[PDB]
Each structure stands twice: as structure tokens, then as C-alpha cells.
Amino acid sequence: FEAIFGTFCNRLEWVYFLTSGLAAAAHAIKFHDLNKLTTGKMLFHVQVP
Amino acid sequence: FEAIFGTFCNRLEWVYFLTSGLAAAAHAIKFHDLNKLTTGKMLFHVQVP
């Protein structure tokens, strides 16, 4: 006869974007209408003592 | 007379495969029907994340 021993399937790790410490640089915020917008912007007033 | 003093037998220590620390690499198993089989095999399935 020709015996066959136990088969194995590879198991996967479950990473997430918030789990990583690289996310600390990120400040993600979902926005469902994101395709509709053109570009965001911010204005910064400054005056010099 | 040509005197003959004591005589000494050759005592010998006994070894075992389980006593060796090399057995830690081994996975000991017995299988009495081994003479019948040709070759075993192990199939492994793997997928890449």
C-alpha cells in the first residue's frame, strides 16, 4: 500500500489598518460622498508679533 | 608455581534511543506493517495573502 499522512492548509494572520502603529500618523474619517467632492482645503490666518 | 590472581569480566553500559537528546529531533512511532508499504507522503495546501 501507499500511506498518506495528515494534510495541512495554511492559516492566515488578520491585520487591520487601525491595529498597526503606522495608523498613529493617520487620522482616518469615513466620508460617504468622497467621490462627489473635488478637493478639500484649509485656510490658516497668521499674524506676526 | 605460576600463580593466577583475579580475573575480570567486561561489564558494559546499556544505551537507548529515547535516552539520547538527539531524539528530540525525532518523533518516535512504531508501525509493524511498514515492510508492506512503498513510500508515504504529505500533501500541503498553501495560499498567499
Contact by Cβ (8 Å): B37, A1: yes
| Nine-digit cell string for B12 | 558494559
Residue from the list B39, B45, B46 with its beta carbon closest to the beta carbon of A2 = B39
Would you call A8 helix, strand, or coil by DSSP? strand
Query: Partners of B45 in the beta sheet?
Result: A9
Query: In angstroms, what separates the C-alpha of B32 from chain A's closest C-alpha?
Result: 13
**Residue B5 phi, psi dihedral angles, 5° rounding:** -80, -145
Q: Give the separation between CA B31 and CA B9, rounded to whole angstroms.
A: 38
Q: How many CB atoms lie within 10 A of CB A3?
A: 13
Q: Which of B33, B34, B36, B44 to mutate to test the interface with A (most CBs of A within 10 A)?
A: B44
The count of CB pairs under 8 A between chains A and B is 35
Percentage helix, strand, coil, to 5, in chain B?
15, 5, 80
Look at the alpha carbons of B26, B30, B32, B36 in this order and tell me if their dihedral is positive or negative.
negative
